[PDB]
């Protein structure tokens, strides 16, 4: 479903995004689609946002994060849509 290709997009994030990355990883102008993956990745985790033994579901609702996404809780398992969530808040840079 997902190529490979995908993780090698260049991306300029928007505020919000870069605030949050900011938190987990050295400030750039510009990441690339896996740094950002690894990143919120970091974030999520750290801040023990993903309930795994639980339908696999990160909660944030009372989270920056939410706000970001738009909603309370997503599952992880929906790759294509988090990457839906993530686009809309970055500009890809070519
Ligand atoms: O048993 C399954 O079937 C199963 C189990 C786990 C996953 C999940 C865990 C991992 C990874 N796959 C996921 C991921 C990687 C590459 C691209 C995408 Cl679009 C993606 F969502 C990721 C991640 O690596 N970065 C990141 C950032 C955000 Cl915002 C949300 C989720 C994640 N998950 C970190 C885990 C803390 C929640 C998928 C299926
Ligand atoms: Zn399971």
Same mark, same amino acid.
Request: charged share 25%; hydrophobic share 35%.
């Given at each position: 479903?997902?190529?490979?290709?995908?993780?090698?997009?260049?991306?300029?994030?928007?505020?919000?995004?870069? /605030?949050? !990355?900011?938190?987990?990883?050295? =400030?750039?102008?510009? $990441?690339?689609?896996?740094?950002? #993956?690894?990143? +919120?990745?970091?974030?999520?985790?750290? /801040?023990? !946002?993903?309930?795994?033994?639980? =339908?696999?579901?990160? $909660?944030?609702?009372?989270?920056? #994060?939410?706000? +970001?996404?738009?909603?309370?809780?997503?599952?992880?398992?929906?790759?294509?849509?988090?990457?839906?969530?993530? $686009?809309?808040?970055?500009?890809?840079?070519?």
């Amino acid at each position: 479903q997902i190529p490979a290709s995908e993780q090698e997009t260049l991306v300029r994030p928007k505020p919000l995004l870069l /605030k949050l !990355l900011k938190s987990v990883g050295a =400030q750039k102008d510009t $990441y690339t689609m896996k740094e950002v #993956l690894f990143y +919120l990745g970091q974030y999520i985790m750290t /801040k023990r !946002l993903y309930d795994e033994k639980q =339908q696999h579901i990160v $909660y944030c609702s009372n989270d920056l #994060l939410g706000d +970001l996404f738009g909603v309370p809780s997503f599952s992880v398992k929906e790759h294509r849509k988090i990457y839906t969530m993530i $686009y809309r808040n970055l500009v890809v840079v070519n």
